[PDB]
Amino acid sequence: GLSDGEWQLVLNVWGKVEADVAGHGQEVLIRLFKGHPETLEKFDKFKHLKSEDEMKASEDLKKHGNTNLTALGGILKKKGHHEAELTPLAQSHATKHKIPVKYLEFISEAIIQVLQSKHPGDFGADAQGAMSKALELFRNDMAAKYKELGFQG
Numbered sequence: 001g002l003s004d005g006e007w008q009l010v011l012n013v014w015g016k017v018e019a020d021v022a023g024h025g026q027e028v029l030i031r032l033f034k035g036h037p038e039t040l041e042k043f044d045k046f047k048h049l050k051s052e053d054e055m056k057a058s059e060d061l062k063k064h065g066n067t068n069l070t071a072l073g074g075i076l077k078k079k080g081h082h083e084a085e086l087t088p089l090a091q092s093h094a095t096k097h098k099i100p101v102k103y104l105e106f107i108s109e110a111i112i113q114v115l116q117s118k119h120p121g122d123f124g125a126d127a128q129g130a131m132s133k134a135l136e137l138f139r140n141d142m143a144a145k146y147k148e149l150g151f152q153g
């Protein structure tokens with residue numbers, strides 16, 4: 001449910017992410033992990049990362065953050081008619097990776113925090129509100145696909 005206006009504010013601020021996808025991605029995962037330490041346990045390759053410093057040095061963490069936001073940008077660019085891009089992600093996240101809807105909320109918070117921290121001037125009240133609705137739409141559609149597949153939404 002976003003207006004055309006809100007989608008344009010989302011994709012305008014996503015333009016900033018697109019100019020450095022891996023750096024934003026690495027910051028999002030570090031914020032996720034440092035705010036909610038338990039999420040780190042879903043990534044078997046990152047169990048030895050015992051500090052923010054180790055996290056910043058990890059080339060695999062930065063690659064995973066890049067892969068994550070490149071996929072999320074693909075979903076945002078479809079503005080809601082994103083069923084095709086969303087399904088495989090809910091499939092893998094519900095079945096292979098075992099990621100609960102709650103962690104999708106934590107990572108939504110980390111994305112907003114990263115955007116606010118890196119682009120304070122470009123991420124004013126209207127852009128923030130629209131990005132919150134866009135990520136809420138992503139979470140709600142992920143939740144609904146989880147239900148369809150027989151999992152908890």
Ligand code: HEM
Pocket residue numbers: 039040042043044045064067068069071072088089092093097099103104107
């Ligand atoms: C904005 C939300 C997210 C996006 C767009 C996203 C995207 C992706 C993509 C594109 C992949 C690789 C392809 C695939 O397996 O589907 C992936 C893998 C993975 N994701 Fe996510 N993800 C998100 C949130 C999460 C969260 C919150 C967690 C757990 C805290 C998580 C855990 C994982 C794991 C464990 C893998 C496999 C990595 C490996 O094999 O080492 N994801 N994710």
